[PDB]
Design a binder for these strands. Sequence first.
DNA 1: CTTAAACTTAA
DNA 2: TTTAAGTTTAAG
Length: 244
Amino acid sequence: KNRAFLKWAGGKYPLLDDIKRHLPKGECLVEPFVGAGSVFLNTDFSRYILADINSDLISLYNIVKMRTDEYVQAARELFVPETNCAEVYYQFREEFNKSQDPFRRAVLFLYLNRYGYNGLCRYNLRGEFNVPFGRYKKPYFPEAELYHFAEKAQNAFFYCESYADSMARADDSSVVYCDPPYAPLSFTLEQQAHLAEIAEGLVERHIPVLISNHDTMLTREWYQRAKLHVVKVDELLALYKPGV
DNA sequence: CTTAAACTTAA
DNA sequence: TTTAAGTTTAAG
Ligand SMILES: C[S@@+](CC[C@H](N)C(=O)[O-])C[C@H]1O[C@@H](n2cnc3c(N)ncnc32)[C@H](O)[C@@H]1O
């Protein structure tokens, strides 16, 4: 199992086997909520359409893909012991927030993700990264995961857009997997239900859609028109399967 | 996770 | 003619 080079909340890494077990085959996989892209890195589709609302994330992904060797060499220089203190961290965080250069921001983004607290990605309403120092002993530099990502990204397109726009890209040969922000144990409840509506529209166009979420009475109401599978609170896999 | 600041509401 | 109580936001 291949790991993502980013630390991300709800990476769905221990759930990969279950997801892949209920994920239909197709020419193209569409991910409206790509995140770290664990499913992307552990599946074998001919091409991928990967989207997310986070512009820094999508920007980073395209840079790692197109300027791989340049990026790895630049980002590696920040994974040294000298940068592992709070004072240096908050200066790099400041440099990130003031920079208008996509490459430099992408380089610092990896640093902030590995040196920041719990790999959190948090912004204020100004759009400024404000995750505090993580105080780690020895942050790992994901050089292998970076190169593996770039290799797989050769057949992937990245888009910075909401789920409704990315799911509209799906066609007859597509499969859609959705990993939205977790429902109550930002992404509103109305958006949670609207996601299910779009999936119902797609499944009538003979486009298979798989949704992962918490197993609650509220999520079961949303995904009531789908085949429900309980994993291991519990994890819910809502599969929308077209009837040929 | 926590506290503090920013901002609104009521009466 | 006011300000404590609430709600949201910022950030260690
Ligand atoms: C990794 S997925 C959810 C993972 C896991 N279920 C959890 O909640 O911890 C979260 C991602 O969805 C993206 N996202 C949030 N709202 C979105 C939206 N409206 N449209 C597309 N992507 C969105 C965020 O950028 C974030 O990276």
